[PDB]
């Protein structure tokens, strides 16, 4: 029940929904369900907008996947602006990375989605954690604006 652990659970839950890994009987939390619907509302459109760009990147490893994630995330927020919509795109992008990694990584570890979700949660809490605290948090700011 820590701050990083809750963000890690959200990041890992979404990758399970993207890869369509079945969870316990009932689905994840209501917060992860609101997040999954909003990020699904985005993901397929982002892929179909960046097919030329994504078809030319080599996401062949975890470090390689982390390098590209850090690179895109630093330029997206290079204006110093954070909102709940931009946070949704952080989850939407990790879903595209894990699908490119699944198709390009040779001999992956079991549950590689847990490794990708880990450094994705590190970025969210280190660079948007203080902002999330100051705009209602997850149960009062995010859910209450998309539900």
């Amino acid at each position: 029940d820590s701050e990083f652990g809750y963000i890690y659970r959200l990041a890992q839950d979404y990758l399970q929904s993207v890869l369509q890994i079945p969870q316990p009987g009932s689905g994840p939390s209501k917060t992860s369900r609101v997040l999954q619907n909003v990020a699904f509302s985005v993901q397929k459109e982002v892929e179909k907008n960046l097919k030329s760009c994504l078809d030319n990147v080599n996401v062949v490893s975890v470090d390689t996947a982390r390098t590209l994630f850090n690179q895109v995330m630093e330029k997206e927020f290079e204006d110093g602006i954070i909102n709940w919509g931009r946070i949704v795109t952080i989850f939407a992008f990790e879903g595209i990375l894990i699908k490119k990694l699944l198709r390009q990584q040779i001999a992956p570890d079991v549950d590689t989605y847990k490794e990708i979700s880990y450094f994705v949660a590190e970025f969210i809490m280190n660079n948007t954690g203080e902002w999330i605290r100051q705009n209602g948090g997850w149960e009062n700011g995010f859910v209450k604006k998309f539900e």
Partner: peptide
């Protein structure tokens, strides 16, 4: 990153 940024602002409406 430009794409994702405006996809995000879009939903912030």
């Amino acid at each position: 990153x430009t794409x994702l940024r405006r996809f995000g602002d879009l939903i912030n409406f």
